[PDB]
Design a protein around this ligand. Sequence first.
Ligand SMILES: [K+]
Ligand SMILES: [K+]
Ligand SMILES: [K+]
Ligand SMILES: [K+]
Ligand SMILES: [K+]
Ligand SMILES: [K+]
Ligand SMILES: [K+]
Ligand SMILES: [K+]
Ligand SMILES: [K+]
Ligand SMILES: [K+]
Ligand SMILES: [Mg+2]
Ligand SMILES: [Mg+2]
Ligand SMILES: [Mg+2]
Ligand SMILES: [Mg+2]
Ligand SMILES: [Mg+2]
Ligand SMILES: [Mg+2]
Ligand SMILES: [Mg+2]
Ligand SMILES: [Mg+2]
Ligand SMILES: [Mg+2]
Ligand SMILES: [Mg+2]
Ligand SMILES: [Mg+2]
Ligand SMILES: [Mg+2]
Ligand SMILES: [Mg+2]
Ligand SMILES: [Mg+2]
Ligand SMILES: [Mg+2]
Ligand SMILES: [Mg+2]
Ligand SMILES: [Mg+2]
Ligand SMILES: [Mg+2]
Ligand SMILES: [Zn+2]
Lengths: 94, 134, 135, 38, 176
Amino acid sequence: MFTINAEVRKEQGKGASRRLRAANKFPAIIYGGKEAPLAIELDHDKVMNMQAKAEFYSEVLTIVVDGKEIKVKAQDVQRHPYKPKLQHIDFVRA
Amino acid sequence: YVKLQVAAGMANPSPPVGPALGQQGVNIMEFCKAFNAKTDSIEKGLPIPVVITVYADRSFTFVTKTPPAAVLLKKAAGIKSGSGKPNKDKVGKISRAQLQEIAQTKAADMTGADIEAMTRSIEGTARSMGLVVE
Amino acid sequence: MLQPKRTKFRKMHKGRNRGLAQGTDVSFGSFGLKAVGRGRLTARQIEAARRAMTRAVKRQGKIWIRVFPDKPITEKPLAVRGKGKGNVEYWVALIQPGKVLYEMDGVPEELAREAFKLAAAKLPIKTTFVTKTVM
Amino acid sequence: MKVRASVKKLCRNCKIVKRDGVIRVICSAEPKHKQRQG
Amino acid sequence: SRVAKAPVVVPAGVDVKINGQVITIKGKNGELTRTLNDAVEVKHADNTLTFGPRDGYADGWAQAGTARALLNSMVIGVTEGFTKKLQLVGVGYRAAVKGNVINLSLGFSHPVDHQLPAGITAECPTQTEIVLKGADKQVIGQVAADLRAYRRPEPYKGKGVRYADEVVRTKEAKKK
RNA sequence: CAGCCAGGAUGUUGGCUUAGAAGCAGCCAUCAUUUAAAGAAAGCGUAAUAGCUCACUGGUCGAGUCGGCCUGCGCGGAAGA
RNA sequence: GAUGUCGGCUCAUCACAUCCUGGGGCUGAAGUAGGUCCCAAGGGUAUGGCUGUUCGCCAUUUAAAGUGGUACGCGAGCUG
Ligand SMILES: [K+]
Ligand SMILES: [K+]
Ligand SMILES: [K+]
Ligand SMILES: [K+]
Ligand SMILES: [K+]
Ligand SMILES: [K+]
Ligand SMILES: [K+]
Ligand SMILES: [K+]
Ligand SMILES: [K+]
Ligand SMILES: [K+]
Ligand SMILES: [Mg+2]
Ligand SMILES: [Mg+2]
Ligand SMILES: [Mg+2]
Ligand SMILES: [Mg+2]
Ligand SMILES: [Mg+2]
Ligand SMILES: [Mg+2]
Ligand SMILES: [Mg+2]
Ligand SMILES: [Mg+2]
Ligand SMILES: [Mg+2]
Ligand SMILES: [Mg+2]
Ligand SMILES: [Mg+2]
Ligand SMILES: [Mg+2]
Ligand SMILES: [Mg+2]
Ligand SMILES: [Mg+2]
Ligand SMILES: [Mg+2]
Ligand SMILES: [Mg+2]
Ligand SMILES: [Mg+2]
Ligand SMILES: [Mg+2]
Ligand SMILES: [Zn+2]
């Protein structure tokens, strides 16, 4: 039942990623299968609240990007070194 | 008002009974005459603490109390001593017949709907002393 | 008081202490005390905090120390002017933000929080209470 | 009166109050618990 | 806020007069006037005063709550008044009222003469009791506090001047 | 939520110990109970009981209330010729 | 191409982290007498024996015999 709304990233790299996290979003990547990887931006507060549930890391999530729905599983998460924040997430296509 | 566990047969020994109720204001002689007539039919050596509703000028009248339960458990056990920590060492488990005989003492002065419930209250002190049922 | 049983060399350059820590996850227990600041932790401090923690939990559960004082620190004695490096006097662990310093298991979370607060009161660096995460 | 940098409730009857820019602890049950930050 | 919400009823025989911020209350027990804080708007309405905040004031609701409490105390004061009772505890401690001066003997080498304010009266039923009466709650509280201050109750025998409804905790002198 | 109103009883002064320990020095059992409800009891207090009252259960009162997280600016911590 | 030293004497001036005196909170504060903390710098704050001493010990006082800064105040003021 986990649904996450995402945007396609229009800029990549250190500066753009830091600007995202200063604007209270964070970057993430969807890869796997035969499709090309998709780099996305997520809303930090909503996703941070969702990932508190243990089922976030075991269930099949749905990421809505540009209207299309993609079934994924959380694969890796980079956390802030000491704040309760998220830096990045890997999603693998399910 | 100084209260102590008064004996039923002995009247006016200075240490244990003098300040028990003779110093309260109760006529100790008349109390240990009327309650003594009661304890003449009561069994030998049963300390039964009644609730005192008395005066201070040699006038008295008393209410009755149920005879206790913890005194009568050590008869068939053969030991007149207690354990520092029960459920580890016991004075010898006793019979449900003796436990029900003890419960018979506190059966005629209760308002419970079902009388079978209070079989656990009597064994509360049984477990607190070392008398575990079979 | 932790200190290496033996070392290749007696004395070490001062160096510096930049960067973020490695070892930022509760890896052995369920709860952790994590550094938020940057600094040095002396062996005496590590041991004072360990004592405080352990007495708070009444020696129940399990406690891990994730840091070890492997850097020797020299001092020059009083009233000395050069003339070679001073003498090793104590040992420290370098701490960067994010470093999990202690972990606990086998106790309730409230008790772990209390024990860790008592411990953090012995340390020269700001810290925060963390819990194990599944990923 | 205790005068400390750290003033805290010491029992369920202690109350924190700020008077004239000063944090104080006032206790209905125990005079030993009276504190003022300073 | 919640205190300011509740309006205060004006009983029959009590006349209120609102002139901007100045409020005057007249009753069978006396006349009391108060200048309200500038953040408070008070409406007479229909035999019931209501209190609210004026626009542009950050503490308007707090000021309105205090204004409501004060006006309610004013109404009670002009209708039924306020009474305070003090007791003297200790051998030789005595009180007596003459006109509007309370004479206290409290173990000092000099007598105590306390002059009452304009609108406070005192009676001494017994030699160890003082009863104050007045229309101003704050004033009667101040007078009672001043009388108690001469000999505040002490913690080993409770001796001194105490409020009648005051719990005076005692303690025993340290052993040895 | 806060406020105000009622009870906290039966075994039982549980047992040990002590000159006495009674819920309230300490130690072990720490479970029932009628029931709307009561921890063999939170301190105070008694030489010790009595007493005090918390936990504990609701009756009124009619709109918000509680405390964690992050974050901006401020407060105390702050004594010298 | 010189900024005279330790101690004493004479004369001081400031700070307050207060020795006395003033005001207060807590006390394991009965009283008398103390302990500890807060406020407070107005004024006050030993003479002798020993030693070059500062210091210190000792005798005997006092409400008390404060702690520091001032080129470890002060030798174009004295001593030496
Ligand atoms: K809410
Ligand atoms: K000076
Ligand atoms: K003084
Ligand atoms: K004092
Ligand atoms: K002065
Ligand atoms: K010397
Ligand atoms: K000089
Ligand atoms: K000279
Ligand atoms: K000169
Ligand atoms: K000269
Ligand atoms: Mg750059
Ligand atoms: Mg380098
Ligand atoms: Mg490194
Ligand atoms: Mg003031
Ligand atoms: Mg600051
Ligand atoms: Mg300031
Ligand atoms: Mg020259
Ligand atoms: Mg000062
Ligand atoms: Mg004084
Ligand atoms: Mg001066
Ligand atoms: Mg001045
Ligand atoms: Mg003057
Ligand atoms: Mg001579
Ligand atoms: Mg000489
Ligand atoms: Mg000099
Ligand atoms: Mg000087
Ligand atoms: Mg000169
Ligand atoms: Mg010479
Ligand atoms: Zn308190």
